[PDB]
């Protein structure tokens, strides 16, 4: 009835507590480290199969096969070394908004605008690929799918609810319900023990994959956030927003550490992914280029401009050999 | 290369050919995004013709598709960019909706947001003023002044409907790129699909001549 005032009281206490523990302002501590010079990455390969906008990609743990899901109603599994295609998985629903690749290299999970993260099977008998499951239950739209193991797939729907599924049976084992608006992006931990979901109301929450208690809740953005990725350590994670401000948060400090923003930028972020070292943070913009922000000093270190229309997905391989950007041109480059 | 990589590149070319061929056969069908306010009568027109729902109907040797997305409550501004490159936007409006509550202003404001949106700049907007009979009976009870206070004209169905039509056809800020076609749902005839056809064939001809570099 009146508990809104006590909610305000606790919110002020939180802000006071996380404020009174800030003495660094990371940009101050990083003053000593020499810059990364200037890095320019030449387009090595131009993987061109699609005939419409491509919305996702995910480097299989092989560091070779990437799966790229398009709006043509066909996700194709590329071979990043020889440009060859190995599957053309004709998906039932034309609309696709995400794509995953199970770390074993067996399963690949599509999922689009009709609420059914629908997993596929690659290493099968009979040659062709089948639909193992169709994980229905959501009442919004799938925004990302990510694989824990060949059995467990988390999802990020438009019902404001991230849900962990069980492939074996096809039912929501747990439903994480804390957010206000849409959930536009999701990212697992290198230890797969706790994931973060970037909502659509400028709140990036850290869930626990086991229980389902949102241990922390980060704020700072003014508009929608469209991309999350963990620092490969697993004690920090970027947020890509529509404010154009890719902000590096922290898991233990509980607050924002620094902000990556250039006053000549206006367009929103679509993707963020750290390099293997965690030194340089990539970010896919709507100015048809993906700037490479030094993730220690906030200074831009390069520009990867080879795209006609905006970039939608940006996947960094699991040995830092090569990044890949998925445009709306129907060509996804592989920079190095 | 090698003995295996040759067969791998052969597989690559084979599925690439199949992908391009499906591309052709997919591009052969005209797409029609179906907007409409809550209880605008999407059911009426969707049953008149034949998550997301994809309805495939054919007429006069053209394969149409309608995505009645209205059956979804989420952030519109996040998934609407999935539909740029659609031929037209079939935007049905409940014409009996002038009486209820504000609902007409709601439908008009949705039209305003969908008709001046960044992605739809070139897409010609059809709109169906459906349920004309209930509005036609209703005017004699309550005047159009209920929802349009500025309205100054005759309280006859024929002129009132024309004013409503003109009030919508005014909304578009860009007038030279996207022509707004209009029809009232002839319940006892097949002129609804016929008008959809005439609308789509017009925008196809215009696009196809602009393609030829003459226009």
């Amino acid at each position: 009835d009146q508990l809104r005032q006590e909610a305000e009281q606790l919110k002020n206490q939180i802000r006071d507590a996380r404020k009174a523990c800030a003495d660094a302002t990371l940009s101050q501590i990083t003053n000593n480290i020499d810059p990364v010079g200037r890095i320019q990455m030449r387009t090595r390969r131009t993987l061109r199969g699609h005939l419409a906008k491509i919305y996702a990609m995910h480097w299989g743990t092989d560091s070779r096969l990437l799966v790229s899901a398009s709006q043509d109603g066909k996700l194709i599994i590329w071979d990043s070394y020889t440009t060859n295609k190995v599957h053309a998985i004709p998906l039932r629903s034309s609309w696709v908004m995400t794509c995953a690749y199970a770390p074993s290299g067996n399963y690949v999970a599509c999922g689009g605008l009709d609420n059914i993260c629908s997993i596929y099977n690659l290493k099968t008998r009979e040659g062709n690929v089948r639909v193992s499951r169709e994980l229905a239950g959501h009442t919004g739209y799938l925004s990302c799918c990510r694989f824990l193991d060949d059995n467990q797939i988390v999802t990020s729907s438009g019902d404001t609810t991230c849900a962990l599924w069980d492939i074996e049976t096809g039912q929501q084992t747990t439903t994480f319900t804390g957010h206000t608006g849409d959930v536009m992006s999701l990212s697992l931990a290198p230890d797969t023990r706790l994931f973060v979901s970037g909502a659509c109301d400028a709140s990036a929450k850290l869930w626990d994959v086991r229980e389902g208690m949102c241990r922390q809740t980060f704020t700072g953005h003014e508009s929608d956030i469209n991309a999350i990725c963990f620092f490969p350590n697993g004690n920090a994670f970027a947020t890509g927003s529509d404010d154009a401000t890719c902000r590096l948060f922290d898991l233990r400090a509980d607050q924002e550490l620094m902000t990556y923003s250039h006053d000549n930028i206006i367009c929103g972020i679509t993707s963020v992914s750290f390099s293997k070292s965690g030194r340089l943070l990539l970010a896919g913009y709507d100015d048809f280029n993906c700037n490479v922000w030094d993730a220690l000093k906030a200074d831009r270190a390069g520009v990867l401009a080879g795209h006609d229309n905006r970039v939608s997905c940006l996947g960094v391989t699991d040995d830092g050999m090569a990044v890949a950007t998925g445009s709306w041109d129907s060509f996804l480059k592989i920079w190095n | 290369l090698s003995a295996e990589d040759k067969a791998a590149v052969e597989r690559s070319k084979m599925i690439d050919r199949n992908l391009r061929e499906d591309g052709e056969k997919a591009a052969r069908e005209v797409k029609l995004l179906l907007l409409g306010a809550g209880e605008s009568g999407k059911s009426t027109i969707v049953k008149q013709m034949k998550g997301i729902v994809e309805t495939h109907f054919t007429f006069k040797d053209l394969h149409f598709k309608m995505f009645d997305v209205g059956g979804q409550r989420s952030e519109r501004k996040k998934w609407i960019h999935c539909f740029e490159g659609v031929t037209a936007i079939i935007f049905c409006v409940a014409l009996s909706d002038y009486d209820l509550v504000n609902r007409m202003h709601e439908s008009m404001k949705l039209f305003d947001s969908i008709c001046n949106n960044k992605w739809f700049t070139d897409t010609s907007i059809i709109l169906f003023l459906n349920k004309k009979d209930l509005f036609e009976e209703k005017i004699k009870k309550s005047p159009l002044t209920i929802c349009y206070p500025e309205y100054a004209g005759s309280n006859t169905y024929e002129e009132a409907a024309a004013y409503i039509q003109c009030q919508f056809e005014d909304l578009n800020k860009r007038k030279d790129t996207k022509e707004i076609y209009t029809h009232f749902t002839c319940a006892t005839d097949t002129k609804n699909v016929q008008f959809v056809f005439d609308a789509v064939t017009d925008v196809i001809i215009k696009n196809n001549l602009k393609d030829c570099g003459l226009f």
Partner: single-chain antibody
Amino acid sequence: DVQLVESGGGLVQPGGSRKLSCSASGFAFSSFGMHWVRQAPEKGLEWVAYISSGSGTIYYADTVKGRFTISRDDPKNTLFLQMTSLRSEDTAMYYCVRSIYYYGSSPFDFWGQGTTLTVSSDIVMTQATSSVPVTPGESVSISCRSSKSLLHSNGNTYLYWFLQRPGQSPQLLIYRMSNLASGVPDRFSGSGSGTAFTLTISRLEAEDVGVYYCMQHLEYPLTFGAGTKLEL
């Protein structure tokens, strides 16, 4: 399930003709590069013919070059072999085997039951070992020697290992000298380097005896070894 069976065997007088039809059933026939490999009554396997996906590519063994004709019918899921002017040297069983060629695939992963047809610069695989008796429970290492650097520029060595059980059709054990097949016990392992290979089978038991051919796949025509007959 996956099932390869063919028919049209019996005897033919030399200089005659036959059409052997492999009736593939239980998978997608169109996407599978199908092979034809024969076996003389008491000799090792030889490569005969080949058909790729959609008949876009064909090869032949130098022994039957232009003398045979291979052809497939996708919509019916059948593989034909038109053979003319048969010598007395083509008397053998004729297996029709599937092979799917993409990255991380398992070619030759299934072999048909096979039909007998009696009549009245290539790489050579010098499998030096012929017969070694082993007791169930021990570890034994078979040897295969190539005639050419098999570690290709790609980084992988194209050398397969087939086990033929007595009076059966031989299944795949390991592909590309290291990786295990689909549905094989983990006891089997391969190792070695360029131009020197082994199949170090561990804790051998019963229902595991037979002959082990090392089909190098690096170049065409594919050449098998003599085979090592494991006795008890």
